[PDB]
Amino acid sequence: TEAIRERYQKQIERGAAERDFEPVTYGHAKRAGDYYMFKYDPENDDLVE
Amino acid sequence: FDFFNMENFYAHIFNIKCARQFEAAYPAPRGIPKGKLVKYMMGFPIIIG
Amino acid sequence: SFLAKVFKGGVIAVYLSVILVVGRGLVRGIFTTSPSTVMFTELPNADHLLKICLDIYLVREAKDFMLEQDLFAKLIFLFRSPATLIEWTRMSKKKQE
């Protein structure tokens, strides 16, 4: 359940272009919200065939 | 009333910007967990109070 | 007879009444954060709103009340539509520029 969770995070976060992220100072990347990681329906995931 | 609203907005903006600068004035490795000292240098006090 | 004892129950009531208000209010506010005050309290880069906040005072010093009034609606609208607030307070780019 942890393995399937990680890959989707990669998928859309990379289909995007971003704008330079995560400098090395904790508490900054927590404010990196955007519109590109909410482009999927929460239930439109066909895990089963 | 508009005067008071403007002063409140100025105070809020000033506080936010200054907190961002103070947080940025101290670099911090993005990953390593909180050190044992730091934790006991912050958590412990609260519990006792 | 050192102050005798007023209904210890009543004492405990007040003794708790104080313990309540403080935590259930002040302490709560201090430790924790309302689900509504997240779009404002944390902002990646709050340097563009400070410019307007200083500029309105700068105009106020040099009269020109027209610009003084036309630049307060510009600020009041930023606290109305969260999309423009998120667009404007986003972190700057010269570093990778």
UniProtKB/Swiss-Prot annotation, chain C:
Q: Which residues span the membrane?
A: 2-22
Disruption outcome: Reduced brood size due to defects in ovulation with incomplete constriction of the sheath cells impairing oocyte transit, an accumulation of ooplasm in the uterus as a result of 'crushed' oocytes, caused by incomplete opening of the spermathecal-uterine valve, which in wild-type allows the fertilized oocyte to be expelled into the uterus, and sperm navigation defects.
Instruction: State which tissues express it.
Output: Expressed in the pharyngeal-intestinal and spermathecal-uterine valves and in multiple reproductive tissues including the germline, somatic oviduct, and spermatheca. During reproduction, it is expressed in sheath cells, sperm, both spermathecal valves and the spermathecal bag cells.
Q: Which residues lie on this side of the membrane: Extracellular?
A: 23-97
Localized where? Cell membrane
Q: Which domain of life is it from?
A: Eukaryota
What biological function has been recorded for the protein in this entry?
Pore-forming subunit of a mechanosensitive non-specific cation channel. Generates currents characterized by a linear current-voltage relationship. Plays a role in reproduction by positively regulating inter-tissue signaling to promote oocyte maturation, ovulation and fertilization, and sperm navigation from and to the spermatheca. May play a role in regulating cytosolic and endoplasmic reticulum calcium ion release.
Query: Which family does this protein fall into?
Result: Belongs to the PIEZO (TC 1.A.75) family.
* Misc remark: Piezo comes from the Greek 'piesi' meaning pressure.
Q: What is this protein called?
A: Piezo-type mechanosensitive ion channel component 1
What is the scientific name of the source organism? Caenorhabditis elegans
Q: What is the lineage of its organism?
A: Eukaryota, Metazoa, Ecdysozoa, Nematoda, Chromadorea
